[PDB]
Design a protein around this motif. Structure first.
Motif, PDB file in Angstrom:
ATOM      1  N   UNK A 147       0.961  -1.042  -0.430  1.00 17.83           N
ATOM      2  CA  UNK A 147       0.079   0.175  -0.410  1.00 17.83           C
ATOM      3  C   UNK A 147       1.147   1.026   0.197  1.00 17.83           C
ATOM      4  N   UNK A 148       0.832   1.906  -1.053  1.00 18.26           N
ATOM      5  CA  UNK A 148       1.466   3.044  -1.802  1.00 18.26           C
ATOM      6  C   UNK A 148       0.569   3.486  -2.714  1.00 18.26           C
ATOM      7  N   UNK A 149       1.408   5.404  -2.113  1.00 18.33           N
ATOM      8  CA  UNK A 149       0.528   6.056  -3.393  1.00 18.33           C
ATOM      9  C   UNK A 149       0.583   5.856  -5.086  1.00 18.33           C
ATOM     10  N   UNK A 150       1.606   5.094  -4.832  1.00 22.58           N
ATOM     11  CA  UNK A 150       1.852   5.487  -6.572  1.00 22.58           C
ATOM     12  C   UNK A 150       1.542   3.996  -7.454  1.00 22.58           C
ATOM     13  N   UNK A 151       1.464   3.794  -8.932  1.00 25.38           N
ATOM     14  CA  UNK A 151       0.931   2.986  -9.397  1.00 25.38           C
ATOM     15  C   UNK A 151       2.018   1.694  -9.911  1.00 25.38           C
ATOM     16  N   UNK A 152       1.502   0.845 -10.815  1.00 19.83           N
ATOM     17  CA  UNK A 152       2.424   0.296 -10.966  1.00 19.83           C
ATOM     18  C   UNK A 152       2.871  -0.721  -9.934  1.00 19.83           C
ATOM     19  N   UNK A 153       2.609  -0.781  -9.288  1.00 21.37           N
ATOM     20  CA  UNK A 153       3.016  -1.119  -8.018  1.00 21.37           C
ATOM     21  C   UNK A 153       3.678  -3.100  -8.594  1.00 21.37           C
ATOM     22  N   UNK A 154       2.209  -3.798  -9.898  1.00 17.00           N
ATOM     23  CA  UNK A 154       2.771  -4.898  -9.518  1.00 17.00           C
ATOM     24  C   UNK A 154       3.867  -4.923 -10.499  1.00 17.00           C
ATOM     25  N   UNK A 155       3.832  -4.132 -11.586  1.00 12.73           N
ATOM     26  CA  UNK A 155       5.306  -4.263 -12.254  1.00 12.73           C
ATOM     27  C   UNK A 155       6.558  -4.343 -11.459  1.00 12.73           C
ATOM     28  N   UNK A 156       6.370  -3.645 -10.532  1.00 12.44           N
ATOM     29  CA  UNK A 156       7.325  -3.520  -9.310  1.00 12.44           C
ATOM     30  C   UNK A 156       7.184  -4.317  -8.625  1.00 12.44           C
ATOM     31  N   UNK A 157       6.533  -5.446  -8.623  1.00 13.24           N
ATOM     32  CA  UNK A 157       6.371  -6.789  -8.099  1.00 13.24           C
ATOM     33  C   UNK A 157       5.879  -6.371  -6.451  1.00 13.24           C
ATOM     34  N   UNK A 158       5.299  -5.729  -6.629  1.00 13.02           N
ATOM     35  CA  UNK A 158       4.337  -5.104  -5.396  1.00 13.02           C
ATOM     36  C   UNK A 158       3.232  -5.528  -5.184  1.00 13.02           C
ATOM     37  N   UNK A 159       2.783  -6.548  -5.662  1.00 14.78           N
ATOM     38  CA  UNK A 159       1.485  -7.213  -5.878  1.00 14.78           C
ATOM     39  C   UNK A 159       1.343  -8.242  -6.372  1.00 14.78           C
ATOM     40  N   UNK A 160       1.217  -9.038  -5.245  1.00 14.80           N
ATOM     41  CA  UNK A 160       1.510 -10.914  -5.764  1.00 14.80           C
ATOM     42  C   UNK A 160       0.163 -11.810  -5.372  1.00 14.80           C
ATOM     43  N   UNK A 161       0.076 -12.731  -6.260  1.00 12.26           N
ATOM     44  CA  UNK A 161      -1.207 -14.005  -5.806  1.00 12.26           C
ATOM     45  C   UNK A 161      -0.755 -14.926  -4.830  1.00 12.26           C
ATOM     46  N   UNK A 162      -0.558 -15.297  -4.009  1.00  9.11           N
ATOM     47  CA  UNK A 162      -0.221 -16.103  -3.179  1.00  9.11           C
ATOM     48  C   UNK A 162      -1.088 -17.193  -2.983  1.00  9.11           C
ATOM     49  N   UNK A 163      -0.441 -18.135  -2.448  1.00  8.76           N
ATOM     50  CA  UNK A 163      -1.782 -19.302  -2.104  1.00  8.76           C
ATOM     51  C   UNK A 163      -1.426 -20.494  -0.925  1.00  8.76           C
ATOM     52  N   UNK A 164      -0.708 -19.083  -0.438  1.00  5.65           N
ATOM     53  CA  UNK A 164      -0.070 -20.527   0.535  1.00  5.65           C
ATOM     54  C   UNK A 164      -0.317 -19.058   1.952  1.00  5.65           C
ATOM     55  N   UNK A 165      -0.579 -19.416   3.344  1.00  3.42           N
ATOM     56  CA  UNK A 165      -0.105 -18.628   4.307  1.00  3.42           C
ATOM     57  C   UNK A 165       1.736 -18.326   4.420  1.00  3.42           C
ATOM     58  N   UNK A 166       1.749 -18.951   4.288  1.00  2.00           N
ATOM     59  CA  UNK A 166       3.841 -18.611   4.883  1.00  2.00           C
ATOM     60  C   UNK A 166       4.253 -18.154   2.984  1.00  2.00           C
ATOM     61  N   UNK A 167       3.512 -18.031   2.126  1.00  6.30           N
ATOM     62  CA  UNK A 167       4.147 -16.620   1.439  1.00  6.30           C
ATOM     63  C   UNK A 167       3.560 -15.699   1.735  1.00  6.30           C
ATOM     64  N   UNK A 168       2.190 -15.646   2.093  1.00  8.51           N
ATOM     65  CA  UNK A 168       1.820 -13.848   2.575  1.00  8.51           C
ATOM     66  C   UNK A 168       3.227 -14.028   3.902  1.00  8.51           C
ATOM     67  N   UNK A 169       2.652 -14.581   4.265  1.00 11.52           N
ATOM     68  CA  UNK A 169       4.245 -13.757   5.053  1.00 11.52           C
ATOM     69  C   UNK A 169       5.684 -13.054   4.220  1.00 11.52           C
ATOM     70  N   UNK A 170       5.116 -13.767   3.821  1.00 19.06           N
ATOM     71  CA  UNK A 170       7.522 -14.003   3.289  1.00 19.06           C
ATOM     72  C   UNK A 170       6.756 -12.623   2.793  1.00 19.06           C
ATOM     73  N   UNK A 171       6.412 -11.842   1.768  1.00 20.32           N
ATOM     74  CA  UNK A 171       5.829 -10.820   1.394  1.00 20.32           C
ATOM     75  C   UNK A 171       5.423  -9.908   2.219  1.00 20.32           C
ATOM     76  N   UNK A 172       4.857 -10.252   3.493  1.00 19.15           N
ATOM     77  CA  UNK A 172       4.939  -9.032   4.294  1.00 19.15           C
ATOM     78  C   UNK A 172       5.888  -8.938   4.866  1.00 19.15           C
TER      79      UNK A 172
END
Ligand SMILES: CC(C)(COP(=O)(O)OP(=O)(O)OC[C@H]1O[C@@H](n2cnc3c(N)ncnc32)[C@H](O)[C@@H]1OP(=O)(O)O)[C@@H](O)C(=O)NCCC(=O)NCCS
Ligand SMILES: CC(C)(COP(=O)(O)OP(=O)(O)OC[C@H]1O[C@@H](n2cnc3c(N)ncnc32)[C@H](O)[C@@H]1OP(=O)(O)O)[C@@H](O)C(=O)NCCC(=O)NCCS
Lengths: 287, 388, 388, 287
Positions: C48-73
């Motif tokens: 959560x930042x104000x700028x866009x294109x967070x996804x291309x910067x890899x700041x938006x991902x789809x995970x399948x596991x709690x362990x990955x969520x935490x990683x990302x966090x």
């Protein structure tokens, strides 16, 4: 004539509904140029052999229609009139009854800044005997002619129509401005149209209780209408502060009585028949 | 539709406007218990009816004791208050408002309506409170100030300040007045009101503005989008036949005369009434049917018109509508037999089958006439009562 | 001011608009616990930042596991995300949004802004969602549809139906779209927004519209009447000096160049920047003081401009204002001694005491010049850095 | 000249406040005809030797003032402008900064339907060198003359003023249309006034980033303004999507850049000085 003629192309909002269907069937059979209708969701179909569109703009683009007749329920009416103004429609006839007063208050301001003419709402009707009929009225009592008629009442108009058709007099155009307290067009608006219509030789003004539109009209007549005017005001026996059917039929704060209006007119030089039986008669005079 | 003073005051409360502390009470016990909750006397007790002039009719009093509150409550509850604004039959009192008394320094007037002429919501204020304002307008119109709400901007504060200064208010009262102007203006728009009347809008000995009384009229046309005002309708305050006609899609307004008038279309209905009166008649009512003139609708119209035992004739005057002038005649015939209409019925048909129907009527044998015109059906029903 | 995607979505929720179920999280534990509360995976996690294109910067991902969520966090929290819409310094990630994944059938665009040209709030929709819309406008402008809110009537439903039909929506989607148009139009007006961007406004495999992302911009000028939006400001998302200048009643906007510009008036400030650049200079910032050019204000302006270590000169250009051209010179003098300004300062005064002040400056002995004109003060500060 | 002259009678809203007091003191000393001021609650007193009223209508009634200058804080500004329009005021100069955009959106529609001219809001200023000064500007750099100046910037205007006063050229009238995104009056509005002003021989147009008002002005100039025009656009080095001081100074969605505006103008035949040092100079050309 005024407002409409054989050339007016008309679309209908709320066209695939009961009243829109029924009355379009009538307008159609009277030769009126219904070029189509608008019903959100039913665009692309056809009804009464005419095309049905999703938006008024789609309709106007497709047909060049300049007038719209509205049979959309009260709740959705403001949206309807505004869509029409937005789409380019220049003449709107809103039959719908029960539109909230505050909505008409806004729509009236919109119509005026936008240079759009609205007859109504609340059962008005416009008919140019011979050429065009947009309304719910009975056009076989009408006779192409020389009398111009403006009325806040539908049925009271019919009487006047018959009387002028019977004295052979005829009707240039008949305008029912509706029964609501804030109409899209009022007496003065239509009176001016009749004063400028070569075909209109005499004007029959039909009022009733409530408001001071007649009184205002009287004054206007007294200074701008040269053609002869025969006026009749219904509701002399009406009680005060009681709605007499029409949302606008009501004497508020002891003002807008049937007698006041009669008086005002008489004071402006208007043949005021005390009985709606003598409208045809009184025209026979001045005319 | 009209609301009761207590309902207007509740509404005023929700919009933070000021009003006396009070309780609408439905029993003498509820009323007397109100005193205690309100505080130290004295207390104002008020019959809750829609008409005005309740005070002159003695339906509004200031008591100093719980024992008097109860008296007043027992006296009025379940009875009908007749004021100069109700018919001689008056209106049922089912709620009594018990509120704290107020120390009135001065009485003002603040109201609003939809002005047909300017086609704007217009607020009017006057230093002449506590008086029939229509009179303040007549006698002294320079003492009434107005402002129209701009429909493009909403009510604006300067507009309330304009009125406050014209009323000669100063200091904190100017801001209080402006606050009330804005709130009342907001209720007017949000609740689709047709009318507001704070008479009197009171300046108190302690120096604050307070709504001592409140009259609200809602636009009935907007009730579909005003659920709260919708549940507040009190039918006991209206002639029951009106609610009856309405439910049946008729518009009924009882009158004094003896000739029942059943017409299609309000303008015709009024012109018909007028023409009957023109010819010595005396219209017993206003009833407008319109289109759907089915058998039941025409029979319901009859029942309603004939509920008034002073009706000595019924004039039917149709003209068009969706129903054929003869199916309308069979509907009348049946209503006359069925309802056992006991009075002469003059019918004026017009449109499709005006005579196949005017025939059917004469052919029935029922005391159903079939006028030959308007000024005729006029004279005929006027005749049909001459001395009865 | 800008809000965060989660805040826009909260707001959307209050206006009954639809958005993915999600939780803004401030710790890796909070984030991982979000998964369980959301339901079955997979989950979308979003910096959560104000700028866009967070996804291309890899700041938006789809995970399948709690362990990955935490990683990302753990990965992101406390770090700065740099996207193509932020400066190379990026923005701090202090909240991670964890929301349910969505089954995207199609991606649409729905947005609104105040159109300066028509002077109306304009809503625009396109079937081209998920793409930089400025481009959809460039390439394919026939695929963008607009409607302007009538300021006399409020947004109207036909307007949302107009857009829905142009997007080729049908059946229930038309009513859903209209609903969202009206709600977003209502938030825009009620919350005094400057901008709305639902990109993408998604049609789901299950057939419903849903706001997959949301960008809201509030009118800062209205914050006095928007307390809720007022408390949502996140300063960590803005250059701190901007907040600093603002608090001091200065308007600061950092730039790349090396010449600090301190002017009174935004238009002058920009023309000054422009003239320095015209003469080989490279403006290090935009700073506009205006009137109140007191000693402290001028010293604060200095501190702010000089916080950027790449500043190799400071050009002051005053012209009028409430302060006399010489009291302004003493204020500079003091700021130079006090702040120990370590760079050449060229001053262009104009107005009262333009020379008693231009004198005072030369008379100080401080490395404070005193330009003779504009194109001059230009060349002079441009000179004062030539090779440094 | 345009908008104002020695005869304009001016009242001040927010007159007993700091900025209204200070700037009225200035306008007064410049000979400007301040006939009074309005401050709710202080009606009946006097300030700066002029009368102070409770409402703008009271003020207009009492003085016949036709122009109003507003120094009321942003929160209360819409109420202020609307009171003025209601009271009859025909020219409003709103100095106030920070008025919510949506308020200006409404006020702009009101001004237009009501036939009222508003310069502003956000520090505009109008000065007819010699005759009238309504604003916060420095009138001793001004010289009664022949150049007409319109600018979205206050301080940038001063430069241009000095340059035209220095080349002796003079100023017919100088209009600061303000820095907000939706102003009461824009370039085209004022350009038309200058094209029709006999006294105005040359026009200096001063823009900056944001909006497309300049671009629109260019087009208008290219077809309706015959007098010569010298234009300068500030903010070539401004970053995008960043407010540059002025609420309206911002390049949104890559549109409204300083170069675009320069370009547009050049393409309409406008002497575009690349440096605000050469405005006086460039006028020397065409003039
Ligand atoms: C306006 C009035 C005549 C409508 O009555 P009605 O025909 O019985 O009502 P219906 O619901 O059958 O028809 C209304 C139609 O308007 C349509 N409609 C609703 N909103 C609409 C809009 N904004 N634009 C166009 N059509 C609209 C409805 O969908 C309906 O058509 P449908 O049945 O094909 O869906 C009636 O309410 C009245 O005022 N009578 C006074 C005498
Ligand atoms: C408009 C602006 C110039 C006002 O600044 P200011 O003079 O410091 O503010 P002040 O509070 O001293 O003065 C505002 C005055 O407007 C008055 N005012 C408020 N609402 C008003 C209204 N509707 N009509 C008239 N006057 C009003 C205030 O009462 C105050 O006068 P007072 O001090 O006599 O009570 C400033 O906000 C600005 O926009 N600057 C941009 C550069």
């Amino acid at each position: 004539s005024i407002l409409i003629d054989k050339n007016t192309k008309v679309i209908c909002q709320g066209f695939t509904g009961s009243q829109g269907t029924f009355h379009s069937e009538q307008a159609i059979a009277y030769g009126t140029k219904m070029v189509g209708g608008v019903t959100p969701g039913k665009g692309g179909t056809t009804h009464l052999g005419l095309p049905v569109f999703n938006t008024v703009r789609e309709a106007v683009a497709a047909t060049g229609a300049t007038a719209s007749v509205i049979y959309v329920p009260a709740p959705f009416c403001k949206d309807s009139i505004l869509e029409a103004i937005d789409a380019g429609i220049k003449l709107i006839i809103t039959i719908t009854e029960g539109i909230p007063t505050l909505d008409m208050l806004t729509v009236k301001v919109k119509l005026d800044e936008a240079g759009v003419r609205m007859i109504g709402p609340n059962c008005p009707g416009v008919i140019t005997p011979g050429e065009c009929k947009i309304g719910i009225q009975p056009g076989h009592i009408h006779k192409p002619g020389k009398v111009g008629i403006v009325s806040r009442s539908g049925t009271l108009t019919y009487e006047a129509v018959k009387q002028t058709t019977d004295y052979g007099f005829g009707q240039s155009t008949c305008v029912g401005i509706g029964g609501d307290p804030i109409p899209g067009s009022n007496f003065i608006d239509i009176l001016e149209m009749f004063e400028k219509d070569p075909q209109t030789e005499a004007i029959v003004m039909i009022g009733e209780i409530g408001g001071s539109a007649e009184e205002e009209a009287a004054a206007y007549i007294k200074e701008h209408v040269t053609k002869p005017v025969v006026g009749y005001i219904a509701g002399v026996t009406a009680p005060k502060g009681k709605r007499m059917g029409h949302a606008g039929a009501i004497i508020a704060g002891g003002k807008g009585t049937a007698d006041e209006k009669f008086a005002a007119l008489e004071a402006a030089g208007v043949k005021t028949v005390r009985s709606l039986a003598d409208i045809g008669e009184a025209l026979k005079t001045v005319l | 539709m009209n609301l009761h003073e207590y309902q207007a005051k509740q509404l005023f409360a929700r919009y933070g406007l000021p009003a006396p502390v009070g309780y609408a009470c439905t029993t003498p016990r509820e009323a007397e218990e109100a005193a205690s909750k309100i505080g130290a006397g004295p207390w104002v007790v008020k019959c809750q009816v829609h008409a005005g002039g309740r005070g002159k009719a003695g339906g509004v009093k200031v008591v100093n004791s719980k024992e008097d509150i109860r008296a007043f409550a027992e006296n009025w509850l379940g009875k009908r208050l007749v004021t100069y604004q109700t018919d001689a039959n008056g209106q049922p009192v089912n709620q009594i408002l018990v509120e704290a008394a107020t120390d009135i320094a001065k009485e003002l007037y603040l109201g609003a309506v939809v002005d047909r002429s300017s086609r704007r919501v217009v607020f009017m204020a006057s230093t002449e409170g506590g008086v029939e304002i229509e009179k303040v307008a007549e006698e002294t119109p320079h003492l009434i100030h107005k402002v129209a709400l701009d429909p493009l901007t909403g009510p604006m504060p300067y507009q309330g300040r304009e009125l406050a200064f014209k009323l000669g208010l100063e200091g904190k009262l100017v801001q209080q007045f402006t606050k009330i102007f804005m709130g009342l203006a907001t209720i007017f728009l949000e609740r689709d009101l047709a009318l507001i009347a704070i008479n009197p809008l009171v300046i108190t000995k302690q120096g604050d503005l307070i709504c001592l009384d409140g009259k609200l009229g809602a636009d009935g046309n907007a009730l579909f989008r005003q659920p709260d005002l919708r549940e507040m309708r009190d039918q006991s305050q209206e002639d029951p036949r009106e609610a009856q006609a309405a439910q049946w899609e008729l518009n009924y307004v009882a009158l004094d005369g003896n000739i029942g008038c059943m017409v299609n279309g309000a303008g015709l209905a009024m012109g018909t009434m007028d023409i009957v009166k023109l010819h010595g008649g005396e219209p017993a009512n206003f009833l407008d049917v319109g289109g759907g003139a089915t058998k039941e609708r025409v029979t319901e119209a009859f029942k309603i018109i004939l509920s008034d035992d002073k009706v000595k004739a019924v004039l039917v005057n149709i003209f068009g509508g969706i129903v054929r002038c003869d199916l309308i005649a069979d509907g009348i015939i049946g209503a006359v037999a069925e309802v056992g209409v006991n009075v002469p019925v003059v019918v004026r048909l017009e449109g499709n089958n005006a005579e196949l129907g005017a025939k059917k009527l004469a052919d029935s044998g029922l005391n159903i006439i079939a006028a030959k015109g308007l000024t005729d059906a006029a004279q005929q029903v006027v005749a049909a009562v001459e001395g009865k």
